[PDB]
Symmetry: C2
């Protein structure tokens, strides 16, 4: 969340900027005035507590004196007990005010970066750049890597290759359930390992995260909507944890409570996160939108002064990865009304799906500045200064497989993307269709 002082003009803050941001987000603007008002009540309580402390200390000294002189102190004792009973009430109120103030601040989104387009409608997303492989004329219903008619959807290609089983998957785990089979498995592993090797060659540290997280830690990195909507809860006898939606969650907390005190030397720290991911929300057929999938994630901590440059570097890394796979794409700047609480700015890389004949999101890249690091107490250098946290998908692997399937299909099977070959037993350049589909021409 934002610093309490950001709301307080008298403490160098900028509440007007927070109001403008709230408005761009399409979120409550009144919340800002409410926070400021509650802050003043909290301050009044603190003053009142301090005055009671001093009066109490004072009447204590008098009682000591009274007893020393062997004089009755009933009057002072009465005053003491009254001041004491008032102090009790004030302590309770201060605690309540502090709690409610923190809950309110927690509802306010990060300050939307000035570059972001102000709109609630994704039709207004910024077209940042477009890339095509140089031998792919234009995005159309043609497989980019083969020049073949993009005749089959990703689900159909995968079925014909016998690379997954949605029917047995649904029987065993329900909605959108699936097994991967034979080359479906090898392709998924190839993307995971290629992804880890690609990032490690860029100095990222491979990090495989646990897929369960304690509630209290998760709550510090993820917004409310995410719990009562997005995350599966795990029951462990009497205890509960959450399954993660992305390794960004546990990895963001990896350095919680730590301090990069010599940041010129210690930062940036860059992690190639790997984990399975679980989402309660997944809506057609295929492994494009499912409840469980794997992701290689970039997660980076930087000095506050350097996060914007790193943002460009991280999307550049993802772009380079998709270029290496020969997949056409565009990069779009997401409108303000579509940012989650933590993001100050977000670019999506959306790759061309030639059967679908549309660009579909494969990557999101966000600068969350110090919104999470403040909660997680990840300090930077010598109120407090915190690191900036950025996250960017490298590959949601099953979804990336869908894009590969549509772009590498041809009449008799699938061409294997060159960079993935070394990661698959036999280093096949091509794998044939094994099965015909019921519906065909």
């Amino acid at each position: 969340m934002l610093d309490i002082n950001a709301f307080l003009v008298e403490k160098g803050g900028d509440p007007e900027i927070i109001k403008a941001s709230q408005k761009k987000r399409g979120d409550s603007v009144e919340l800002v005035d409410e926070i400021i008002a509650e802050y003043k009540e909290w301050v009044k309580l603190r003053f009142d507590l301090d005055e009671h402390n001093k009066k109490l200390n004072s009447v204590q000294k008098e009682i000591g004196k009274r007893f020393k002189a062997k004089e009755d102190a009933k009057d002072l004792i009465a005053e003491k007990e009254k001041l004491s009973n008032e102090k009790k009430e004030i302590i309770e109120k201060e605690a309540e005010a502090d709690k409610n103030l923190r809950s309110k601040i927690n509802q306010v989104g990060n300050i939307v970066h000035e570059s972001v387009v102000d709109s609630q409608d994704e039709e207004n997303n910024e077209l940042v750049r477009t890339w095509t492989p140089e031998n792919y004329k234009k995005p159309e219903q043609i497989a980019a890597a083969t020049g073949a008619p993009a005749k089959l959807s990703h689900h159909e290609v995968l079925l014909r290759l016998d690379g997954y089983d949605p029917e047995r998957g649904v029987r065993i785990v329900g909605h959108r359930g699936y097994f991967l089979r034979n080359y479906g498995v090898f392709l998924n592993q190839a993307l995971i390992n290629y992804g880890l090797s690609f990032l490690s060659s860029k100095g990222y540290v491979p990090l495989q995260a646990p897929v369960m997280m304690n509630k209290e830690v998760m709550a510090k990195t993820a917004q409310l909507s995410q719990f009562d909507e997005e995350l599966y809860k795990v029951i462990d006898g009497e205890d509960e944890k959450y399954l993660i939606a992305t390794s960004e969650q546990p990895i963001s907390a990896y350095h919680a409570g730590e301090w990069f005190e010599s940041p010129a030397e210690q930062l940036p720290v860059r992690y190639a996160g790997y984990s399975s991911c679980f989402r309660r929300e997944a809506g057609a057929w295929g492994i494009f939108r499912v409840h469980a999938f794997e992701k290689i994630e970039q997660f980076v901590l930087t000095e506050p002064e350097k996060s914007w440059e790193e943002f460009d570097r991280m999307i550049g890394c993802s772009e380079e990865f998709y270029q290496s796979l020969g997949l056409p794409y565009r990069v779009v700047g997401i409108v303000s009304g579509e940012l989650n609480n933590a993001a100050a700015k977000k670019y999506d890389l959306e790759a061309w799906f030639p059967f679908q004949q549309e660009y579909k999101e494969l990557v999101s890249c966000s600068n969350c500045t110090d919104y999470q690091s403040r909660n997680l107490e990840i300090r930077c250098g010598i109120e407090k200064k915190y690191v900036h946290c950025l996250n960017s998908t490298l590959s949601a692997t099953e979804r990336t497989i869908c894009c590969i399937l549509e772009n590498y299909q041809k009449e008799d099977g699938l061409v294997i993307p060159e960079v993935l070959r070394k990661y698959i037993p036999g280093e096949p350049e091509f794998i044939p269709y094994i099965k015909e589909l019921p519906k065909n021409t």
Copy 2:
């Protein structure tokens, strides 16, 4: 579970053999007599239902006649309604008897194979065979692959290599939580991919299973104790699923309700299962006994006549895998009292851990005959004949890493097992210790 007819001597069954097996298991012997008694009550109910059907049909014809002749039928109508009211009761009882009978049978373990040692005490496990690499003199406190003093435990080696993070892991997910880091990640992926390639070269079909399963399917393949003890439950709004303990669970159900009608040609079917695994029970330090880990599993369906030969083939496959990693081991035949419900026979491969100076289980191999396939209705050929199901660990990868760490350690770092090198970026032959431990000599 066992066939109902196995309990019925009059139906070609062998209840004495089931009693003997129960006794070997240290489970209830009385359960067998109880099942037989309840079966007879069920039969009595069925007879009574059939007699009521015939009487009812009979009195119906008379009522028709009576009405045809325009005669009063109050007497017949009364008899009809009485027979009807009795039929209602019988139907309800039959359903209850059938339910209780099935619940009882479900409690009876698979018939323990005659080769299995009859005992409740693992000290009596059969020593089946022992293997050592030919340049490793004997199991002692010496790293088998390097000849170096096995000075460090697996946890210490992994710490010195900076290959995992138990401290940040525990903070984020609690008990035994961990991240894998750098080479810890690459080694885990290497074992997964080596394992898949090793089995696929043997004709196994790679199969990556979903890690969630619907309750009703899980209950058909896994015993009661497993739910109220072993499995995490997942909360999905109003619904619930389980996280799997091993890909053997969903893969055993992969062919549920299917029929291998030409088994000479269609069987055996062999799967190289891959998934993460989740266990509520994990007890020191390290990634040897943890709540979440990955496993490559052999899962095989065969004709009933061929399962014993396949059992030998499957343990042979696991042995060959450990031999290829240079890890000394022994194979032990688990005593009757230690078999789970489904296993008719189980071998554990236990690998030598030179720091621990003990053999520790890395592989279990079981022939479950048709105990699960009967529940899952997986038929074989032309009462009913079902396939046999066998399962054997190829590698619990994090645990296998522990064995590698102790056996490949030397004074200045870790030798990378030769077969894994091709799977790790840079194909390192050796990786140096990066960190010193607080406690040392």
